[PDB]
Structure formats: C-alpha cells, structure tokens
Amino acid sequence: ENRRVNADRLWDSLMEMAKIGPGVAGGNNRQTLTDADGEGRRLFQSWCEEAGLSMGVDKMGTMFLTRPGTDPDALPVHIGSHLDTQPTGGKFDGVLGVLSGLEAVRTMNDLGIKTKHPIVVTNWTNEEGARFAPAMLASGVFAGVHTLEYAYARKDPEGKSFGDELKRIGWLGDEEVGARKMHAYFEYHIEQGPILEAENKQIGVVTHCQGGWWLEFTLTGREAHTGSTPMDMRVNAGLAMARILEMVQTVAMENQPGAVGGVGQMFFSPNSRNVLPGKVVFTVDIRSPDQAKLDGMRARIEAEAPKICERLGVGCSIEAVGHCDPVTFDPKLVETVRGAAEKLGYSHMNLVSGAGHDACWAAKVAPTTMIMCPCVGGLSHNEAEDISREWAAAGADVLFHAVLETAEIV
Amino acid sequence: ENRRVNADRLWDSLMEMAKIGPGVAGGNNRQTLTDADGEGRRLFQSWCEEAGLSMGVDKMGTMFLTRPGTDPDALPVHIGSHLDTQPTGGKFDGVLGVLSGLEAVRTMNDLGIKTKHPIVVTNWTNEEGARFAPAMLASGVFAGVHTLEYAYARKDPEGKSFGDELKRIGWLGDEEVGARKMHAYFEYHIEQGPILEAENKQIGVVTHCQGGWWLEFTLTGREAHTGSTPMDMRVNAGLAMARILEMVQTVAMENQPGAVGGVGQMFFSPNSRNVLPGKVVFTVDIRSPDQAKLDGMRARIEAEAPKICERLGVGCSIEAVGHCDPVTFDPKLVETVRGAAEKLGYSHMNLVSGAGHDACWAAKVAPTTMIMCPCVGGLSHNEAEDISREWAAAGADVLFHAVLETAEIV
Ligand SMILES: NC(=O)N[C@@H](Cc1ccc(O)cc1)C(=O)O
Ligand SMILES: NC(=O)N[C@@H](Cc1ccc(O)cc1)C(=O)O
Ligand SMILES: [Cl-]
Ligand SMILES: [Zn+2]
Ligand SMILES: [Zn+2]
Ligand SMILES: [Zn+2]
Ligand SMILES: [Zn+2]
C-alpha cells in the first residue's frame, strides 16, 4: 500500500524496446519471427537474467522467465503478454505487460521479497496474428486448441512457414508446449478502447473478454479484359467482395450495441489494372461480447455471402482462420485486482476486453484475469498509440500487488 | 486473290513464341522488360533478319524492322503490334499482329514482290500497361502524348523504374522516339470480344476505337484495431472503396449500351487482418465509344466518390494514370481493308474496338486502321484465350493484301 514499482525504470525499458524494429512514425514494426523480433527477445532475455530469472523456451518459441518461490513443489503464477507487434504497431500493445512483469520482479528484488509460489514472466509467440494467422497461436497450442504441426505450417504472404522462421531466428526451444502447469495467470495490457480515458478511471478490472471470428473468403472470378468484355458477360469477384463488405457493415450495424465487423486484409489476383480478378481473398473480422449474437452474425454472413456471389456467377469459399469464444475471467482473481486498486487508492471500473489476448487461452487451463490501463482515444494497432508514464505505472503497481497476494509473501 | 500467306508457318511461329515466358495454364506471363521479354524480342529479331529485314531501335525499345521499297522518296507502311503480355496473357494478344507482319514479309519474299513504299514491321514496348502504367507507353511517346522522362520514371509494384529495366535487358536503342514518319499504319489483332464469332464473320473491319480512363484512387483511413474500435469511431477506407465499386457498376449500367466500368487492381496498407487500412489504392477503368458519354461518366464518378468518402471520414485523392480518347480510323484505309476481305472471299462486318491499342496513338500521326479476327467467347487477358489456325490465317491474308494495295506492287 506504500510499496510501488519504479515508474521511470519501467518507462525507460519501454523506450529502449521501442528502438528495436521501429515503424515509420515512432511506433514499431516488430512482427513475429523477423530479425527485429529476435533482437527484441534477446534484449528481454538479457534484462531478465540480470534480474536473476532463468529461461525456458518451448517449441513454439514462448519464453518463460522464472523467479523461484520458497516452496519448490508449488505451481507458478505467470505474468504474460507478447513482444511481437503489428506492422503499424504502437509501443505499448503487448510490450507493456511483459516489461511490467520485469518491473514487478525488479521491485521484489529491490525490497528482498520472497514468495511461496514461483513467478514466471511469459512472452508468447505470435499473439498478433498479423504475419501468420491465427492470432494467439502459441498460447493456443499451449491450451491444446491447435496442434504443433498446424502451427508450424502457417504461411505468411510471401509463402514462408512459421516452423522454418522460428528455427531461423534461433528460438525453437526444447520444452513440450503446454507441459507447464500454472497456479494463476495475469496479463496487464492497454485498454485499446476509449472507456477508461472517457470515464477518468486509472484501472480497468477486466471481467470478460469478447469473442470473435476470422472468416477468410476466397472468391473465384474469370480473368477477362476490363475494356472489351461487355458488362453482361463479366464474372466480377471484385464487385462480389464489394457487396460482401457492405453486407458485413449492415450485419454489424443491425446488431448494436456490442458488435463489430470489418476487413483489414485483401488480395486480388493477378492484380492488373486491365484484368478483372480471378481470385479475391479477404478476411472478415466479427466480434461480440455475446456468444449467441456472435453465432448469429456468423451464420448470417455465411448464408448471405454465397447468394451475393451466385447472383454474379462468382464462386465462394470460406475458411475460419481464427476463433475465440467470449471468456469469463476467474472471479477470485478479479477480486484480488479490484482489492489491489482499492488498497492503492486508484480509481477503477469493470471492463470487457475488446481485443483477444493470450489470457483468453490461458483461461482454458488456469485461473486467469487481466488488468488494463487507459490509452488515448482508445487508439491501438496504429503507430500513434499513446499512454503516459503515470498510466503505465499505476496498472503495474496493481499487477505487483495482485501477484503478491496470489503468490503469497513470506 | 490466289496469293495467300503460309498458315502453318504463321501458326508454328505463334507456338514457338508461346514457349517464351510461359504462364501456368498454357498462356503467357511475358511482361514488358522482363528477361522473358528480352528472349522474345531476340527470337523475333533473329526471324526478321533471316527474312532480310534491317533493324532500328528507338529509346523506348520499340523495334522497327524494315523491308525497302523501290521509290526513294516514299514513306513506309508500318505493320504494328506488341510482344509484351499480361501476367495472365493469352498466346495471341499482341503476338498475332507482330508475327503476321513477319509472315506477310516472308510471303512477299516467297513471291518475289517489290513495293513502291518500304514496309516496316513494328514491335512497341509496354503496350499492356500491366507492369508499368500507363498502357501504350512507347507508342504514346512516339505520338508526343508523353515525354521520354515521364516514361522512364514509371515504376512497377516493386519500385523498379521503366528506364533502368529497358537498359538491363539490352533494348535501349539510339533513335529519337517519333522521328520516323509513316505513310500508313496497320494493326492486326484478335477482337477480344464475342461479336465476330457470334455473327459468324471471319474479318472485323475496324472503324473506331472506344476510349477510356484509368482513374487511380488513393483513399486515406485511420489504422485501428478491428476488434476493439467501436463502429461509430472507425474511419473505414475499405468500406468507402466498396461503395465506390458499387457506384461504378451503377454508372456503367445506367450508360448502356456502349459503356464499361470495372476494377482489376487493388492494394490495402498495411494489409493485416486485424488493422483497418490506412491506405486503399485502386484503379477504375471506364470506357465508351462516345466522347460526351465518357466525359460524363468521369465527371460523375469524380463527384460522387469524394462524397462517399467524406460521409465515412475518409480522405479521397484521384489521379488519371491513363487516358485515350475515342478514335476514328482513317476511312480510306478502312475501305482498303474491306476491299481485301471481299477480294479474298472472307465474310466481314464493321466493329468498334473494345480495347485500346498502339494503333490509337499511331492515328494521331499517320493514317491508321486495324483488322480483327474472332476469338472464342471474346475471352482475352486470360490464359485460355483461343483462336484457330484458320481464323489467324484469314486475317493475316487481309493484312497482306491491304498492305500491298497501300504500299503498291511493281
Ligand atoms: N491485443 C492484441 O494484440 N490482440 C489481437 C488478438 C486476437 C485476434 C483475433 C481473434 O479472433 C482473437 C484474438 C486482436 O484482437 O487483434
Ligand atoms: N491490347 C490490349 O489489351 N490493350 C490495352 C490498352 C489500354 C489500356 C488502358 C487505356 O486507357 C487505353 C488502352 C487495354 O485495353 O487494356
Ligand atoms: Cl525478370
Ligand atoms: Zn495485444
Ligand atoms: Zn495487438
Ligand atoms: Zn493487344
Ligand atoms: Zn492486352
């Protein structure tokens, strides 16, 4: 209640990691299994070892940095997030949670605090799902949602497989994925939504996570000349994609509040200015806090889209390339978080997470919750993503205390 | 009337060139200024020199192969097309006209025919405008529509410039672009439309070319998280693009008959599945045989599209990256072509060309017309583009006789 993390030390570690794999506007382009990700993992590794943590790496490249407890038989409390970013990443999505875990350890060392349960700072591979789909791939293997082989065979847009890239940057570890058992899992993360800033609250007590689908459409047209083909003879997969995006906007807007839909990825083949496309590939991202509502939006998109296509002579094929159902966080750990906020005198409210997180898969296999701090305009997945020294430190303080309650001081 | 070209020799030259830069389905991917194009140009060069033609090359890489006439004062009759293809090219778009020119020369040699006017077989650089926009770039320089510098600075999607690529494959010539004066220019080309096949006509007597615009849209959104951004806070340039494609389909359909509108090329940035795009870039291709109608479709697309975008918070920027006005071919050469068809006993009808061609720029600077043969289902810019030995030869015969009438036998 007096005991606080070092704000300047946390902040300084965030500005140092921001320099690894810079974007073009003061954010980060440090995507999974690139060289810059390798550099980021090594920097994090070295900081952690100077803090007395010992490293284990699983076959999905997930890094576990351990601070032993006083009971050698006791299961660990993990503090988790990701160091991998979007191509237009901010400095804080993922990174905040991992380096807050480090700061909590450093503070314990500064105060010579021992715990019953070990504490394990965790960096999951390919949270973002920008380079290889799905998102939360490593934590999904951990929870048994995906096989190792399935994960290894994911390809980026240049055709490189996840497995090979992991091996290339040198982070294929020896531990079986998901062989570690957790006593509890905590994730500190920026909100990525406008609510905490708009309501003037310092801490978000995360109760639930909204679920989502990634539906990948492959539409088949007929390559043909854009100048000499009569309109009544075109098989236009581009127009079909256009009508499908409009229909997604309608489904989302007919399902307010608590529903989003949209598309961020799109490919045309062969992508010539005077050739109607033979393939159009894109991903629809739909999400709701409410399972039945999410099921209903999916069924509907999947029924209406083939009819848009059939009206145009266009072939339509859909694959789920990502899926997380809504999650309810562990009520006991939710109280610990609220309690830590109150003990510390920090304004707080409950919150549903808008994004998915590795925490959502962690909750399959262990008591789990999350903590959020505010971010400016709820902007995230943009280089302009912004938090203050003061916001970051507040939530880290809450993380510190929640973890100590759960790991048990001696 | 007895004198016909060698159908097996023409056809065999088409099947030989088809083996250079193969596609993935028995067409061709032999785009401008690739190594495959270098190889195609060299094969054509060697066939022409075996036929006693002498070569000049301009600074745009256009190849002029000359057969002398007996009048020292007389300007040449050119036979023109292109050997460069789309990524999903057929074996016949462009190639038919260039190798028919060669076949006509070989037949003149076989019959020992001399002409008053010299004959110049012409292969123009970057007709297709698939790799570098605009289309008909070299012939455009020739007719004075584009500067040499502007042409050299065109970039492909990987950032290579036209100028450098021309130099690399070894086709930068020494002649000033457009220094040659032509007496007349003829282009034999497949129809790329269904009409000749459907009407059971062997020869298309081309009277006009429909004109067109390439309008390149750059839409500006805000990169944002596709799960955690509320719908009322998204600036969705993808949805804006979707509504613009639908508006184009409406403008085209409301301008029937004689209007086409469509999109073959599209880029999203940064093209991650969970990041709404910051940039969406695409090209709208609009065409009409009627100038006022084409003008009107452009004004309308250019007025309605910024309003679609402004309603979504999206910034809108439009640049013309290609333009040819409707062309009326030289009526005297049109009669020569009709006459050759009649002399030979080939069924014929008039046609407006759906595509643009180098012929359209040639017509700025010399009497010009085109000859078409049928193609199956009017399918073109597709590897499955199809003509028969019999169709190809008939139109070449008409080319031969039209050119002889115009160049004048001795
Ligand atoms: N904070 C963050 O990196 N989160 C990702 C993870 C995710 C993506 C798709 C999905 O279906 C479930 C989770 C995001 O929601 O974009
Ligand atoms: N041979 C061929 O396929 N021709 C091209 C040329 C063209 C392109 C754009 C334009 O505005 C005018 C002409 C096509 O029609 O796409
Ligand atoms: Cl090449
Ligand atoms: Zn995250
Ligand atoms: Zn993220
Ligand atoms: Zn052509
Ligand atoms: Zn073409």
Residue numbers in the entry:
A (entry chain A), B (entry chain B): 6 to 415
Give me lines lifted from the publication on this model:
As a model biocatalyst class, we selected carbamoylases, which promote the hydrolytic cleavage of N‐carbamoyl‐amino acids. Together with hydantoinases, they make up a scalable and widely‐employed enzymatic cascade for the production of enantiopure (un)natural amino acids (=hydantoin process). Based on its reportedly moderate activity for N‐carbamoylated‐ l ‐tyrosine, we produced and purified SmLcar, a carbamoylase from Sinorhizobium meliloti strain CECT 4114. Using this artificial link between enzyme activity and bacterial proliferation, we evolved the carbamoylase SmLcar to accept carbamoylated m‐substituted tyrosine analogs.
To rationalize the massive performance improvements of our engineered carbamoylases, we obtained crystal structures for SmLcar and the double mutant SmLcar_GC. Guided by the electron densities of unknown small molecules bound to the active sites of SmLcar and SmLcar_GC, we performed docking studies (YASARA) with the synthetic precursor, cam‐3iY, for both enzymes. Comparing the resulting structures of the wild‐type and the evolved variant revealed a striking difference in the orientation of the substrate in their respective binding pockets. Specifically, the critical Leu217Gly substitution identified in the first round enlarges the binding pocket and allows the aromatic side chain to flip by ≈90°. While our kinetic characterization reveals that this does not drastically alter the affinity of the ncAA precursor for the enzyme, as judged by the small differences in K M, this conformation appears to be highly beneficial for the attack of water at the adjacent metal‐binding site. Lastly, position 329 is distal to Gly217 and the introduced cysteine in SmLcar_GC (or Tyr in SmLcar_GY) interacts with the substrate to likely further lock it in an active conformation. The Leu217Gly substitution again proved crucial and boosted the turnover frequency (=0.23±0.01 s−1) and catalytic efficiency (89.9±13.2 M−1 s−1) by more than three and four orders of magnitude, respectively. Unexpectedly, the Phe329Cys substitution resulted in significantly improved reactivity, as SmLcar_GC fully converted cam‐3iY under these conditions. In stark contrast, installing a cysteine at position 329 proved highly beneficial, boosting the turnover number (4.84±0.39 s−1) and the catalytic efficiency (849±127 M−1 s−1) by another order of magnitude. When compared to the parent carbamoylase, SmLcar_GC displays a ≈70 000 times higher k cat and a ≈170 000‐fold improvement of k cat/K M. Combined, these results attest that our strategy of linking unrelated enzymatic activities to bacterial proliferation presents an effective means to engineer weakly active biocatalysts that do not fulfill a metabolic role.
